[PDB]
Structure formats: structure tokens, C-alpha cells
Design a protein. Sequence first.
Lengths: 257, 244
Amino acid sequence: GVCLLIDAGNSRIKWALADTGRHFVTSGAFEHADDTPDWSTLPAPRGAWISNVAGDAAAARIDALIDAHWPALPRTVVRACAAQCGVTNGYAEPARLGSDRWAGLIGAHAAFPGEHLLIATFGTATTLEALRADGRFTGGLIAPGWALMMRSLGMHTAQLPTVSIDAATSLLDELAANDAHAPFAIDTPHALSAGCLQAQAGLIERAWRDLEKAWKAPVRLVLSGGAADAIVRALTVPHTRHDTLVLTGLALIAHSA
Amino acid sequence: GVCLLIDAGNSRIKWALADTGRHFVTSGAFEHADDTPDWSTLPAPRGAWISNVAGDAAAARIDALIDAHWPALPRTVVRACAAQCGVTNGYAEPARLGSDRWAGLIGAHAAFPGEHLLIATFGTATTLEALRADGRFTGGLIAPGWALMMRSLGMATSLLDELAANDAHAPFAIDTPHALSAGCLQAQAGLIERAWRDLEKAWKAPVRLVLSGGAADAIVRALTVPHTRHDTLVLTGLALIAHS
Ligand SMILES: [Cl-]
């Protein structure tokens, strides 16, 4: 019955064991450089389905973990394609879309049936994808995430005061503690943090409003990936968080005909 | 009568000779090295007023050019302060505000009397400054500019030109390079629009969006907020300081 689902990204592997397209028996997560998951306890899976955007070392690690537990287990390295699980890929070259993004589109299509979606994923980059209710993925936008913008300004811009990666964390925590209002600032470090917050929220809000106007129907803004607490609090438009779009999509792929 | 005004920024040095109020007899620019302005022709100035955010080598170059033409000319290095020329500095530490930003706020206040302003400058960073109708500079927002955002994502001139030709309210892209370019552009436009609406809400009154210097056609085109361009706020501000 059960399928092992692996969602490997920059530093973290998230995983689930699924007995259907939508149901997880259990799940967890671990850092790929250091950790080993507790899989000694799991029922043996029929196969594994893997989304890996973390590179070849992570691929070798995933294989090592799989084969240490279930030698020679069948596995499928998931990739974007032209059409799958109700989604049609609008990319000019479908296979150039990231596997995590493809699995996530499939999960969203299933999780929110009958709905036009704008999917915002918060990672190193902030990614926005437009998904029609009929399953057409019509395209994307990518912008730097808040920390990446803050690195540009605080560490890579000579003419601005130094704001370290760790100092940016402080400013982000303070934004959240202030419910992410981000007023015009009266000191330069706060001008950086508030301007970067305003860019993130402004991006998402603009894209959502324009998509409703373009498609002439309601659009659900779906938040995926990192918590992005300050960004989420700043938004003035309605939104729905879903934390397992990629794993859900992998379950669907695994249990498809 | 006439005052020499110097606006030394990161990219080059701009200058003007101003006689009456904000009017310029002439103006020009020069690179930080090797260029010499043709100041042999100018009428002798009473003094020079200098905004320099470019550092000490630029300061030395400026002094060298001044003293080569008008030895020992009186000069004043402009710095942000608590209040000057109708503007009040809302920075917690007024002197931490850049002198260029200060002069520009003063020039803006004079150019648009009685108006609330959002002043946007498109440089390596995108800088937004809020200036209330009573002259209070109430703060700033800074984000990376388009090119810097692109660089951070691993990336461009062709892409930027291509964006001007496209519908900025139907921006979703079908390949990764265009998704990056459009995403960065949407972030710039979204930033400006959100900040503007926030000021109109905070102040319960109309706000003029002023573009200080140039902006990519694509960014300007993407905006749904009307704007006014003004290319000489700093030098205009320096003229007002000089005469005060
Ligand atoms: Cl685990």
C-alpha cells in the first residue's frame, strides 16, 4: 500500500509516508547534511517518490537512506512535465520548471478544487505561480526573498550602513512583534527592513489584485514554504496557508493510475 | 551674486552656478577623475556649497578644482541637520541622513509648496522619502533596485528593455529568466504603490509621487499612480541653502 514521499530542498528534507493520494500515515523532517530520520519504525513502502532540488550530494544521501532501510526499493525522481494529475504546464519548456514547484501545483489543484489560485512560496526567493481552476499553470514571477534583499542592502551595498545577516534577523523579529506595519523609518537600518517588507507585501498584493482583474473571478492567495511571519502579518488581502503542497502533490503522483 | 553648487554622488559630480533664487546661470557634470569642468568661462562665485556623499578622495578633487580657479574661495560642506529652509528633519539622529537626501528634500519642499510628497529615487537601491506638506521629513524606506534584485537571484539589459513593451498587469512569465525580470519589476512597482497608499491613508490627504531623476521606462510604465519627474532637487536645494 504505502508510498514514501521525499521533498528535498536547500537544507531540509521533508518526508511522508502516504497510503493514499491525500492521506499521510506519518511524516517528518530533517537537515540533510547531519541527520538521519527515524525510519526503522515504518511499515515497508512499495516505492519512493522524490522531489530534489538540493543537488547531487542530496540525491546520493536520499538513495543511501532508502537503501539502508529497504534495499533496492523502487523509486521515481519526480520532474515537471507537460501535464499530470489535472495540471497543465504553461511553461514554454515544461521540463524547465522545478520539480518542487510542479509537485506543489498538483497539490494545490487538489487541495482547492474549482478555484483559481495564486501560490506564493517563501524561500530564498519569493515565488508566485498563477494556477487556473481548470488546472492550467499559466506562469510565474520570482523575486528575492526578504533576507536576500537585506543581504543585498546590508552587506553588498557600500553606500548603506552594514546590516549583518544576524542583525537583519533582529529587525525581522521586531517587524513581527510590531504586527508588521513597516512605517516610513527614522533610522537607516529600519528603513532597509521596512522597505524590504513593503516590497514583499506590495509584490504579493499587486499580483493578487491584478490576477483577479485579469481572470474575472475570485482568486485564493495560498501561502506555502517558510513561515514568513512578518510578511504574512503585513498582508492586507485575504490568504490561506498550506504547509504540505509539495508532499501532497507527491502523494497524488505516487497514487495516480 | 552667484553661488557655486556641487552635488557629488556615487557616480559623478554635478554642479550649478546659481544667481537668483533657484535659477541656474549654467550647470554641468564631471566624472570623479580625469574630467575637468570648463569653469574658466564662469563669473567668479561668492562661495561654494557642497553636498558630498562620495568620500574623501572626491572631497579633495572638489577642493582642488575650486582652488585652481578661485583660490581660497569660501566654501560650506552641507550636512543634514534638525531644520533648514522650511524642512524639519524627522530622523532620530538628523545627521545620519545623507546630505544629498537633505538638499533634495529642501528642493522638493520649495518646488511643491503645501503638498504632501513621496519622493522616489532609483539608484542601486530604490529610496522612498516621505515629506509632509508642513515640511516635516517623516522618514524613509529603502529596497534593492531592479538590477540589484536581479543580481541577488543570480542574474539583463535586454530583459529590462523587453519589460517596457509588455503589460505590467498581466506579468506572469513562461520561462525562468522572464519570471525573474517580471517578478523584480512587480516588486518595484508594488513597493511604490503600497508606500503611496500608506501615506495617503496616514495623512488623510492627497500625496504627489515625485520621481527624483530617471527611472527605467518599465518601472515608470508599470505604475498606476501618476508621477511628476524632477531632475534637479539636490542642486535646487543647495541653491536655497546657499541663499539662506
Ligand atoms: Cl524525521
